[PDB]
Amino acid sequence: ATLNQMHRLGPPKRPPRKLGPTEGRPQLKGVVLCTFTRKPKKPNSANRKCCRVRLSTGREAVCFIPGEGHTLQEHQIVLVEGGRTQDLPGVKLTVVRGKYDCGHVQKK
Amino acid sequence: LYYRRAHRRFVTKKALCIRVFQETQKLKKRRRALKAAAAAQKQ
Amino acid sequence: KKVRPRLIAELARRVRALREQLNRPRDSQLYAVDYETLTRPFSGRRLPVRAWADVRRESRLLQLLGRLPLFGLGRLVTRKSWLWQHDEPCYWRLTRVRPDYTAQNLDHGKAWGILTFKGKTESEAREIEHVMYHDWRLVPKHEEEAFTAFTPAPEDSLASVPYPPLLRAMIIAERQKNGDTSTEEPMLNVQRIRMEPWDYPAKQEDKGRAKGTPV
Amino acid sequence: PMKGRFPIRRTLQYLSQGNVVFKDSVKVMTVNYNTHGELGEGARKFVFFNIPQIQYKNPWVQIMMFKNMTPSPFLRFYLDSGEQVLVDVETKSNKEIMEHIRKILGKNEETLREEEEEKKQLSHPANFGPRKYCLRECICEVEGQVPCPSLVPLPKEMRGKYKAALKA
Amino acid sequence: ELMAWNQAENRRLHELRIARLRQEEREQEQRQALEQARKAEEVQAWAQRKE
Amino acid sequence: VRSSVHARWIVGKVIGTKMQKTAKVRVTRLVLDPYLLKYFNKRKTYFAHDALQQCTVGDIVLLRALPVPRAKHVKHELAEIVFKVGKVIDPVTGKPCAGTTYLESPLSSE
RNA sequence: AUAGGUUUGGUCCUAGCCUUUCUAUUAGCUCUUAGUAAGAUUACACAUGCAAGCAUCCCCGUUCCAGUGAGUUCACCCUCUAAAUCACCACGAUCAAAAGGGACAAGCAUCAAGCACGCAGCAAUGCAGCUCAAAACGCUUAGCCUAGCCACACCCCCACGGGAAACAGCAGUGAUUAACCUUUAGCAAUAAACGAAAGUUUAACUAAGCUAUACUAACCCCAGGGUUGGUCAAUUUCGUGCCAGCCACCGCGGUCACACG
RNA sequence: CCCCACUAUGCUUAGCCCUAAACCUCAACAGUUAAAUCAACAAAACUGCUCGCCAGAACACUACGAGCCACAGCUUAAAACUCAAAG
RNA sequence: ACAUUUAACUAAAACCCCUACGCAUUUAUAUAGAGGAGACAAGUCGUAACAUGGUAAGUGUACUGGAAAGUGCACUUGGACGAACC
Ligand SMILES: NC(=O)c1ccc[n+]([C@@H]2O[C@H](COP(=O)([O-])OP(=O)(O)OC[C@H]3O[C@@H](n4cnc5c(N)ncnc54)[C@H](O)[C@@H]3O)[C@@H](O)[C@H]2O)c1
Ligand SMILES: [K+]
Ligand SMILES: [K+]
Ligand SMILES: [K+]
Ligand SMILES: [K+]
Ligand SMILES: [K+]
Ligand SMILES: [K+]
Ligand SMILES: [K+]
Ligand SMILES: [K+]
Ligand SMILES: [K+]
Ligand SMILES: [K+]
Ligand SMILES: [K+]
Ligand SMILES: [Mg+2]
Ligand SMILES: [Mg+2]
Ligand SMILES: [Mg+2]
Ligand SMILES: [Mg+2]
Ligand SMILES: [Mg+2]
Ligand SMILES: [Mg+2]
Ligand SMILES: [Mg+2]
Ligand SMILES: [Mg+2]
Ligand SMILES: [Mg+2]
Ligand SMILES: [Mg+2]
Ligand SMILES: [Mg+2]
Ligand SMILES: [Mg+2]
Ligand SMILES: [Mg+2]
Ligand SMILES: [Mg+2]
Ligand SMILES: [Mg+2]
Ligand SMILES: [Mg+2]
Ligand SMILES: [Mg+2]
Numbered sequence A: 001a002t003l004n005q006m007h008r009l010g011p012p013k014r015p016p017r018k019l020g021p022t023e024g025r026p027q028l029k030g031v032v033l034c035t036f037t038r039k040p041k042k043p044n045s046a047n048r049k050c051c052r053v054r055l056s057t058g059r060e061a062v063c064f065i066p067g068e069g070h071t072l073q074e075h076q077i078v079l080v081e082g083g084r085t086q087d088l089p090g091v092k093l094t095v096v097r098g099k100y101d102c103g104h105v106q107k108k
Numbered sequence B: 001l002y003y004r005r006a007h008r009r010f011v012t013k014k015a016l017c018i019r020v021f022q023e024t025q026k027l028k029k030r031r032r033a034l035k036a037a038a039a040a041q042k043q
Numbered sequence C: 001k002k003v004r005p006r007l008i009a010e011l012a013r014r015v016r017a018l019r020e021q022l023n024r025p026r027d028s029q030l031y032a033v034d035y036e037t038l039t040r041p042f043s044g045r046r047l048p049v050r051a052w053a054d055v056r057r058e059s060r061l062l063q064l065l066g067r068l069p070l071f072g073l074g075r076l077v078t079r080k081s082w083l084w085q086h087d088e089p090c091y092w093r094l095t096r097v098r099p100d101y102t103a104q105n106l107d108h109g110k111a112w113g114i115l116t117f118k119g120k121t122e123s124e125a126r127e128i129e130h131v132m133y134h135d136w137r138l139v140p141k142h143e144e145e146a147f148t149a150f151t152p153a154p155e156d157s158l159a160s161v162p163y164p165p166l167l168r169a170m171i172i173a174e175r176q177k178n179g180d181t182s183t184e185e186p187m188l189n190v191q192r193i194r195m196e197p198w199d200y201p202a203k204q205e206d207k208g209r210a211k212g213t214p215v
Numbered sequence D: 001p002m003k004g005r006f007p008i009r010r011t012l013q014y015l016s017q018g019n020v021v022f023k024d025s026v027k028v029m030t031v032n033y034n035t036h037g038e039l040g041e042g043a044r045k046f047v048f049f050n051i052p053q054i055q056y057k058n059p060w061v062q063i064m065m066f067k068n069m070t071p072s073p074f075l076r077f078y079l080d081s082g083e084q085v086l087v088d089v090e091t092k093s094n095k096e097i098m099e100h101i102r103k104i105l106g107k108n109e110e111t112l113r114e115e116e117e118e119k120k121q122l123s124h125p126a127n128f129g130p131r132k133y134c135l136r137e138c139i140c141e142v143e144g145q146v147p148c149p150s151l152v153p154l155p156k157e158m159r160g161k162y163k164a165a166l167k168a
Numbered sequence E: 001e002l003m004a005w006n007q008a009e010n011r012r013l014h015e016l017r018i019a020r021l022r023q024e025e026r027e028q029e030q031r032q033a034l035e036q037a038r039k040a041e042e043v044q045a046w047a048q049r050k051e
Numbered sequence F: 001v002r003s004s005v006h007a008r009w010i011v012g013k014v015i016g017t018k019m020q021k022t023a024k025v026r027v028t029r030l031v032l033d034p035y036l037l038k039y040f041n042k043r044k045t046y047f048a049h050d051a052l053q054q055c056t057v058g059d060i061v062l063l064r065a066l067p068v069p070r071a072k073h074v075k076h077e078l079a080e081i082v083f084k085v086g087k088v089i090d091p092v093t094g095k096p097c098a099g100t101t102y103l104e105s106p107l108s109s110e
Numbered sequence G: 001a002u003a004g005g006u007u008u009g010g011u012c013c014u015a016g017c018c019u020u021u022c023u024a025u026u027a028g029c030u031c032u033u034a035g036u037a038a039g040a041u042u043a044c045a046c047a048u049g050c051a052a053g054c055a056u057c058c059c060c061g062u063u064c065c066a067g068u069g070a071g072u073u074c075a076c077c078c079u080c081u082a083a084a085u086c087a088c089c090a091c092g093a094u095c096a097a098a099a100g101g102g103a104c105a106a107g108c109a110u111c112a113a114g115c116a117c118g119c120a121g122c123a124a125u126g127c128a129g130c131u132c133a134a135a136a137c138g139c140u141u142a143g144c145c146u147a148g149c150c151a152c153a154c155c156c157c158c159a160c161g162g163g164a165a166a167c168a169g170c171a172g173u174g175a176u177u178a179a180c181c182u183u184u185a186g187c188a189a190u191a192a193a194c195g196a197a198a199g200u201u202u203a204a205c206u207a208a209g210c211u212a213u214a215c216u217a218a219c220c221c222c223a224g225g226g227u228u229g230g231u232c233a234a235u236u237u238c239g240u241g242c243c244a245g246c247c248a249c250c251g252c253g254g255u256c257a258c259a260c261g
Numbered sequence H: 001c002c003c004c005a006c007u008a009u010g011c012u013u014a015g016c017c018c019u020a021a022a023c024c025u026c027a028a029c030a031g032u033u034a035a036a037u038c039a040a041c042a043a044a045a046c047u048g049c050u051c052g053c054c055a056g057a058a059c060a061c062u063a064c065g066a067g068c069c070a071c072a073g074c075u076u077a078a079a080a081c082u083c084a085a086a087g
Numbered sequence I: 001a002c003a004u005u006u007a008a009c010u011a012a013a014a015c016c017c018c019u020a021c022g023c024a025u026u027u028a029u030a031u032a033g034a035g036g037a038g039a040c041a042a043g044u045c046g047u048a049a050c051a052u053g054g055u056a057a058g059u060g061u062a063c064u065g066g067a068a069a070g071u072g073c074a075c076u077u078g079g080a081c082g083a084a085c086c
């Protein structure tokens, strides 16, 4: 662009930063609604344990439960954090192990 | 000075805005005589 | 930039100022005192402990003038606090008196007069302060001449005082630096400064007034 | 690279190299110049190179430029008193035009030096406070003075925690 | 004093302008004379053609 | 002499003469672009009291600040018409000029 | 940026994403000492105690300090000139309102027209103008330009009057949020209020209590957390067998897994 | 897709509609062939100046708003979720 | 809408209005129902595209068809035409 054009347009308008699933917050509290499993996309194959929670903001989202073995049930309280599950398309929340009703994975 | 199309909505709104102004101007003057009449009566 | 008008802010302001002029409390209400608890019932505030004695024993200015033909015009009125402090005669020569008609005994109001503090008569009459205090005393007519008898003492007072240590050293250095050779001592002319006593009558015209909020 | 011919003109270094600081009387400067003709080359060079330097040093002076209105280039200065100073610039180089206006309407080097010295007095070395304004923030920075408790802990006898313990 | 000096400089420059303008007219007049001669020949030759 | 009007002397181009005894003048100032460090014209409109209604659109004028604003927007007065539209007299020589050509030669009056 | 990884069977170009650096909050796990600094998520609701008196009565002060960030170009310069300080009439200085002029956030033009927004005249009244793509008019977001400043003070912008009964003063509590300090002491220092003053008062402040949030200095005892395929410093042997699980990016696991436990 | 028949339509007059791979995908004006010419291919590489336009893929020649003789239309033209590529 | 009073040998007293807000005006959230877009290891029908892709492909527009798509008219090469004569 010419100098007149650059003066007339001004500085670049920073494209607004998008708030992810946590809405710019480190963690959110949630209530478990149902627990199910999801099959990953190619080239992976597994039954990844997920749950649907109602977040404190009122939105309902699917959250991956990490670790081997969980005891989560409906109406239980869990803390969720960011971090997408690269296998599961659209699962952008992860349950925190060791907080509220979600306990630490049991050793071996 | 400006090169902008006068579409129907603009043309119609501009007609009313002029009409409203004209009808208000006449009202400003009918609140001039009434005030003058009352002042004359006090004397 | 066009500020949005605040009409209610101006309406209330005018209403308040008006009510402050129509519902203003009188001197009878403001300066009342309960002689048992020694508290002003208007505000329920205790008087200072040092005033309790005189409040019970001494009379207010218009407790004395209410018993005179014309509220004691051209009459000398002193104060106990003055008699105890100063030997020289301190008194007001009353010129005008606005009594408070709302008092059942006409024992409140205002008063103007000419001040004569320590035998020095002021040239003009001004409003008298502390009219509500329990401190005033009326000068009997037959005692006026003797009471006002005063001989002006010699005014001999200190005219010049030395500068403090540091300032003195700095004025002497400027002299030598500029080249002026002199051995005279710098001294402050304190003749202009007329130090008046702390209990000198102040200007009542510039004094404020208690607000209307009654208890 | 930087856009345009002679990109040096769009640098703070070049814009601060102007030596013409008008006296406070100068309010408006109208530059009438011709776009063609050999006799007006200096005026064209003066508009190209020097107006940015003049404006940078005199932000509150209005500079307005008019093209091809008269047969010859000229400058006109409008002073606050109402006087108008016409400077004919035909046949002069851009350097000569610049030196001519410094002499007749520019503050001398002495006047400028004085203003800079008055600014020096605004910052006092002895004053303590934030680094934006003062050299040192606290007396504890001065060597010999009691250091800051954050760096060197104070003796127990000087600390209020134990001052009132010894007494009671 | 500086304003008087500026006016003197403007007057000196004006005296130089008048000298330059006088020379330019002399050259203009010469070029005009040649153009008029050429034009007159063209008109005459063209007028003869149409006659 | 003191005036409450900020702009004391300003040159501008007359752009409107439809108000009675008031010339609408466009005034342009050079403003530095902080990023590009290039000067671009910034224009502002000023109403200037013209008692004689002698201003024409397109002429350059000099506006002196009034001691106090005579109207809501009229804070200046027409001090002088620097260049009349189409009738410019060369300040250097004092001769009438159309563009870059002299209408009357400077050598007519020597 | 001194850059790095990643498109493909492969190469080059372009390009987004991510890695490495530095801070702040929250979570998991873990945690010895001392000094210092800092310290509700919420303009939601608040039990209790305290936070403004002084003083020979009048006055003065409680309009400050302290708090909060809801709203939001009221903050800056110039002009002019109140109140205030300089004991007092001065004086001018200092300080600083109202008024006048100028200047001053972000995103959206799928907000493009606003609809009286101008001028002249002593007035009567006349003229029809004024702003705007060089962004008017609007909507949305946000305290700011931090020796500090601006705004607010339960709500109705205001507060005569209404809803109604107020901690966005200190300590503390309920609810709420990922977010979680004591219902300490003293007016000794400084500051403020008052007094002519000796002085009195102050949840300002000072000195303590609590907390790895940070800095600094220690420790004879006492170390944990993460990671170990490549980017990127660093794995032996087993179990599991596209299962269980892992991954910031590229990816790993289908019976010899340096990638899972 | 091949063969045959026959409409709207291709034509004229009078009004609309306003689109194209409307692309020679190479902007207007002025100038140069000097040097490192220059990623690749294509139609060699550049300078001055100005206007217009473009900032990962997809969603999307779409939704909504607005304008238009257009009413299954045209012009202007996003976002949410998704991906680590697309080219 | 709303009135100039009482008092005057020092001087003061008196002074106090009513009109709005409505289920109207503005911006959203929730949806009977109706549809898109994207994603998604191994479903069904055909084979439209990539080779002259087996009718070269595509653009605009029109009509037609389960579906990709077919056809008309003009336009594009981001196809080719085998590159002396025969
Ligand atoms: N909008 C105006 O009426 C207007 C007036 C003066 C100058 N301009 C100039 O037009 C250019 C385009 O401005 P923009 O980006 O705001 O317009 P744009 O292209 O975004 O269009 C907005 C409006 O401006 C008009 N416009 C567009 N191009 C114009 C042009 N060259 N001249 C005049 N009007 C034009 C259009 O008709 C439309 O009504 C700029 O250079 C601007 O200085 C526009
Ligand atoms: K697989
Ligand atoms: K796999
Ligand atoms: K890259
Ligand atoms: K931690
Ligand atoms: K007091
Ligand atoms: K705020
Ligand atoms: K408020
Ligand atoms: K103290
Ligand atoms: K083409
Ligand atoms: K086909
Ligand atoms: K093809
Ligand atoms: Mg992860
Ligand atoms: Mg004053
Ligand atoms: Mg102000
Ligand atoms: Mg535009
Ligand atoms: Mg829209
Ligand atoms: Mg806010
Ligand atoms: Mg509250
Ligand atoms: Mg309020
Ligand atoms: Mg509190
Ligand atoms: Mg915290
Ligand atoms: Mg502490
Ligand atoms: Mg094994
Ligand atoms: Mg491992
Ligand atoms: Mg036919
Ligand atoms: Mg064509
Ligand atoms: Mg094109
Ligand atoms: Mg063009």
Ligand SMILES: [Mg+2]
Pocket: H061
């Ligand atoms: Mg189309």
Ligand SMILES: [Mg+2]
Pocket: none
């Ligand atoms: Mg469309």
Ligand SMILES: [Mg+2]
Pocket: none
């Ligand atoms: Mg629509």
Ligand SMILES: [Mg+2]
Pocket: I033
């Ligand atoms: Mg539905």
Ligand SMILES: [Mg+2]
Pocket: I047, I048, I053
């Ligand atoms: Mg096929």
Ligand SMILES: [Mg+2]
Pocket: none
């Ligand atoms: Mg085919």
Ligand SMILES: [Mg+2]
Pocket: none
């Ligand atoms: Mg086709």
Ligand SMILES: [Mg+2]
Pocket: none
């Ligand atoms: Mg088609």
Ligand SMILES: [Mg+2]
Pocket: I064, I070, I071
């Ligand atoms: Mg068919």
Ligand SMILES: [Mg+2]
Pocket: none
């Ligand atoms: Mg091809």
